[PDB]
Amino acid sequence: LDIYTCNYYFGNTTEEKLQNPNYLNVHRVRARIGHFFHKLYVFLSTNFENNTNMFQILLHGLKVWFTDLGQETVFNEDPNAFIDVDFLENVQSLSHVNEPFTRTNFAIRANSLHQSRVLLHSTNRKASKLENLLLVDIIQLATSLYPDIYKPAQGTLVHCMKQLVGSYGVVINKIIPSLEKAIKDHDYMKIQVILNVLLIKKIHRKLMTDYKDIGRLIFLLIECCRVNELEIGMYADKILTDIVIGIKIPSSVCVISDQAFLPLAPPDGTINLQVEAVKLAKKKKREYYLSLLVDLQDKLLDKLDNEKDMGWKIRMFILRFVTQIQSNLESKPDKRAVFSIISQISTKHPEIIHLVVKSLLSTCNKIISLSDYEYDITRAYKNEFNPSFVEILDTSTTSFPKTFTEEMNNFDNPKYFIDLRAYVGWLCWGRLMYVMSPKALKLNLRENELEVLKTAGHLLTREFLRDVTMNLVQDNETRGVFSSGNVSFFSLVILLISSGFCELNMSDLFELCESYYNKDDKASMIMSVEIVAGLVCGSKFMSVSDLDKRDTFIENFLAKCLDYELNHDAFEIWSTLAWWLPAVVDLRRSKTFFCHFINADGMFDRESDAATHQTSKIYMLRSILMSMEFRAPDVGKLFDELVFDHPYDQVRQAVAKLLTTLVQNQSNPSISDPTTLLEAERNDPDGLGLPLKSVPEKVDAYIKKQFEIIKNLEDSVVGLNPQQFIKTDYFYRTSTIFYWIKEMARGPNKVLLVPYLVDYVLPFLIGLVKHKDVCALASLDPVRLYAGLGYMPIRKNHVAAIVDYVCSSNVALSSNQTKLQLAFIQHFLSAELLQLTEEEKNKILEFVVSNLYNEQFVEVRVRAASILSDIVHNWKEEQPLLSLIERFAKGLDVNKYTSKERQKLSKTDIKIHGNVLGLGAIISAFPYVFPLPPWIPKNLSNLSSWARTSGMTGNAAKNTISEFKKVRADTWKFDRASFNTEELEDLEGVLWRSYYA
């Protein structure tokens, strides 16, 4: 009974209340008010139909009479005279602190609990005879013609179905009858309203559950698909389309660990026969529903086959038999459906055809999945993934690692295939590995399912694939596009073909394909190559004598197409295939296809001809090797066959982008055991782990070679010029290597590129005093790459050798490629800050500072100071600091020298340019110390007697004082006061440009 209890006054369901005069008094009064509201409704719809204001006030008097029963829900939340519980909670509650509330809050909190105990009381009930009379009225109002009335009534009838039981039933059995009427009474705006009703959240939802009535309703919304005159029929289509997307039914035995209901199993003996009884009724309630849909299925195919031509809402049917003759959890594959769904190709309509395919492909992938599941419909949702042709493999097997490698290179006697994305391996072996069997079977199905597939292949004529692909090409001219939905349909035709049902012979798809290859029509070529990808996904289909007719057709076709004469339109398509196909099928299901792109009759070597042609391969071989990344990659050839020497860019760059990919394929560390693995990660130098992806020695050898082959040729440009440079072999190599580095530093290959920086990649790149103007020509930005390598995935021990490479005691070697190493540092620091040992944090700072002084280049003394500040910003400890300030201001402090001399010195002395550049950086490293450090005034003062001298240092000391006076700008109302020193005056010159006097 009662568990809510809210001081109902008349006693909490004791029927202490029934024996109360005050309680029959009260309801006898709500009865009168109820019977009076009806008295007024009939009096208005009769005397005042054309009034909105009246009917609104009545419709609220009913929203109340039906709801404000136990509780008060309209008016529920108006600001009243109680403090709000939600407000006060924000003010008082700290978090991680149990109820730190003042007395005031505790009191609303409690009142708030009473008030919620009231609203808890479920007001849901059985309709009260009179309550049914008023709910019928509220419908004739939500069925009225005035939007100013039907819109509040609908909102008012929804608050009334929340409150009555199976009231939805009462509503429908009134709607449908009085919609069937409003249709044979013509174009009514009462039809426009009834449709507005059917789109109410609460109704539109209960619709996908009304199996009885949705029969009759869909046939009414269909008759309605005629704008005999209005917004109707637009609404009837949105609604019939909303419907196809709901509904269904679940036969499948809740794959439940039976422990989902046991723990709550009552002692009660077999007083749980009841359970096995419910199991049985909720099982023919279901089987009746399931039949009602089949009845609706066949009663529509009637109105589609028999209705000579209804127009283009020919679509509801198809959009639906589909989410049905392929649902499972039952659904008896009807053959009359597969007939009708195909004979709608005769309307030659783009949208219908796109759907007949989308449907025929699902209506089969369901029948197919009955054989693979052996009619054990349950077996789908059981992660003991049945399929008779799936096979698990043990990977711990002492020996396995080299089965894989030497089995992925096997194209002739293939033992297993992994269609899709091959996960297991790569990191380590040991798991079980789901895999697929060779010359995959077809399997058997019962006769009902057999005659259905027959009724497709007997319909897939030479003529029908002609009509259907044609169309898909023309609807396709607008867009381009590929959709797998297309390919995964051709594999289907193939299953049907040589499994028995079609008999079209494969030599029919070889013409259908060679047919749609007009070197001209793009959407037409896309259909041809959509066809090819199907013949390679059609090895999940028997015949080793057809898998040879197909391997043979494909080496012949790729010849015509890719072996010279290739537009940026084909390349656009085929290159699309290479990135895709190897991911939807293991490519070893074909001896010719792969063993064709890797046949590399394409990479010339020098230029006094036309060299030759293109990445008429490279970028496509690569995009296959990229999508396998693991599998097939035996490429003893390619490495021995790469170029570097190539004269053209489009190729030099592509040979680089390929090597990048060739390296990522031999870098996977796939280990023997998880245990063998974690013992390698544990014993690493960095408390961190193993370099993930590590380039394997035999390759670290190749690369090292290409760098030291380029060092061999430094004699090749012994003295040539930019024009006789782009023509040397030394350049060609160098350009290719560069394009390669650019593509390593991008993406998941970074951890591969690091070991080479310190000895190879940074000595290179700074191939830049190897000519600045040679870079502008063959547009290469080295500066931007060398420095962009300051940020990146470096490891504790690599930092060491890199800081040692910069800060080189051989430094003195370079020249204004100095302001380069100095900018690489500034970036490293920002990405290895907090990770640099105070040792390294110093080898850097002693280099930076040794440059504020380097005779010759004024350019760099300044780029050094700008950088010295990046350091002194994270340097708050006050004795490293205050010991620099001193080192610098000893070279200047006081009037060490009299006026005439400062002028002379300011222009030439380097040891003092540095001292002022340095001390300048220190001050510019504390931009906003909110209350000002007194070492700053006293050390700008030492800097002001110097920014009063015109020359080279006195200049970069004016920088330092203007830079400063500027950033201190808004805090200056105040900073003025820590300048007792009338050396406030001393700071007025400072900034001078030509426009001041």
Partner: protein
Amino acid sequence: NVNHWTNELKNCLHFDFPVALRKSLATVYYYLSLVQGQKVYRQMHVDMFERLVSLDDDRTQFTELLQKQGLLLDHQIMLNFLCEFLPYPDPDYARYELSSKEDLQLFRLLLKHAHNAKPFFDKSKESLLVDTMNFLLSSLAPSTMMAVMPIVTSVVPYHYHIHSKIIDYFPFCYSIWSSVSANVAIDTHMYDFVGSISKDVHNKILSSEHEKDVVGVEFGEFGIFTDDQMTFMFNRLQGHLRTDGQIHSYSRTVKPFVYAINGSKKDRFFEKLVSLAKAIETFIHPSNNGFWTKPNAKFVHAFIKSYHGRVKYEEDICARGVTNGICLTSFCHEEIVEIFLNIISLGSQNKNPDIANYYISCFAYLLELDPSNAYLIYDKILIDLYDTLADQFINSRHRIISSLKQFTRVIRFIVMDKLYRVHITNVLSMLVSKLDMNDTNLTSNLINGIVSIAAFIPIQDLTGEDDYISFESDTLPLVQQHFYHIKCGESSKTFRVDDELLNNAFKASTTVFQSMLKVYVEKIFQLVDVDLEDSLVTKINQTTMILQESMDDKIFNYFASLLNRNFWSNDSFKEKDPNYELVTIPLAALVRRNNGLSKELVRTLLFHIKEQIKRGAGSVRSTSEIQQRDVKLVLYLTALNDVLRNCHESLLEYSDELITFMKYLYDNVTNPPLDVITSIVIHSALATLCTTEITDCRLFPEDSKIPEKDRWGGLQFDPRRFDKQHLSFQWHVPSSDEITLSISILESLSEYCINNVEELMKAPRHDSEYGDMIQKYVLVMTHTLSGSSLLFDPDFNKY
């Protein structure tokens, strides 16, 4: 039907039941959530589980009690599902693909469910840890990265054994991490891991069972982390805040850093945190906005939530005897403030007000730690505030609004420190008078201050008649001296004052309440005529009602004769369309507290309403708008509605004079916009008799329910704040007398309406002053059904 009951159960957790039955219920919902084969409302079932296993159901933790009570759940079922999200060969069958919402959204749920049932995987199946990793690991490859990592973080149990511990698997995480550059698609999982695991070790070490088979996991310098492991995560977090902005919900990303602190071997860590604050320093500055200003803010908050988080969990344990030297010391709380103070001060001035409310909300968290430093913060915040009230910021908008938010998110704490509290009377009577009528925003941010001061302070004269008293002479002089001191660089620790003088200042400071409310009421009536709207009209009524409850009868009985006075004699309801709410409701809240005030307030609203009707008010017809010659009648009618609603049993006295006035109000006065008002009178009087509600909300009861008069910070921190003799709430319970008048009315108005309407069924279709009258009686009938709604029984028709 399943889904229904699964709900009525949810409804049952509100009372209690045996942990031996939770063992049962949990087991049902763990295995239920993981169904397959039909339409399932999973979100519900994973939520039952999550609420059944709640780790803080009112300080009680049900995962502990369920572990101890023998709950064990199958991991193979969970992992077997989360693995359908791996590349199943033969594309024709792969059912789940990330990327496409509908799928990723299930995966995110399973993963959540697993995290929930991680602690019920057999601590005893020693080879459950190793077995499960040795499987996920072999499954890891670029194409799985996305689905494997998350799994690990939420399906593998934190075990720790003699040979194979879970931290055994760290060196492998810092192999992936540290190989790609900052990538939120990755990092987010690494931090989630090494952090919810570091949190674990810490939790387990304390109080409970310091084991789980191995206390063979040592803490030290940097939590469970190597020297280089910690070093790495620091430069990576710096990478995030300065370069690559790659983080989401930061609560998660901060854990590892908080739970690597060791109270007795901090030092080396704080050294690392300081250099990370000095790096980050510039990027917080109010004029360096960029891609980073979010990350730095959402972090400096996430970190100080997740630190104070820990502290208040340890201080709950040193209320169980167990200190542990791993614990956070008084001196960590110190060095935390040293670090994030300039940082927090810069952020709070930021140009984005949301990005500021993050830095500003950190003051409250720091002050709860009651560090020795506490003064440093109160020092800033109070200068910034006193400067602002002295218009020294008038050129800069943000500083004014900022330093009023700083001060609000910290009022409750100032009411305590026996020095600052003095200022609080001044600062309030200053806010009240500075309430602007042109600046909607400044006013919303002032009410914030004014209501916060009232929520944690009793408006009471605390003077024992001590003669020296007066606000000047005794409070002001001291307040100025404290401020002079604070302003010249000196801090409040250097500030010496006699415990005699400082308690004169405090008591004399509680005198100004009277002269200040005369200025608040004045400012309210000025606000009745402003286009402030909604959010802020409400918040203002909270401040007026909170101010009332924090008032002793001495002061309140003044406030009452001051609303009463000003409500009648006012020149303040002109402008078009007024906010009556701001004045009618504060009256109702007087009658809540003192029913006696009603007998006469109501009879004055009626001989003033009859007055306005009799002189042509509501004479002129109009839908759509309230005629401005009516505005007065509408005031008195809103007041009568709002003030009956809170009359209660005191309405029994003048029962007959009301009903007969209500019948008068409906005989005369027809006008569709006034009828939506007049028809509410009947409701506000039926609801007030039989609605069962609170009545008392006072900060401190009766005027006398003495905890003494050291009773400022509203007991908000005292443990007596909730012993039953303090919380002696009043409550209105409907008596047999009230229900009986309640019913007299119901039938008397119910008849009145039905007659006058059964009359008009001699139809004038024209009139239109007819459809006005039928609407009238149907509204009066309607609001007669509501409020009077508590007397009805849903079930009556069964019986």
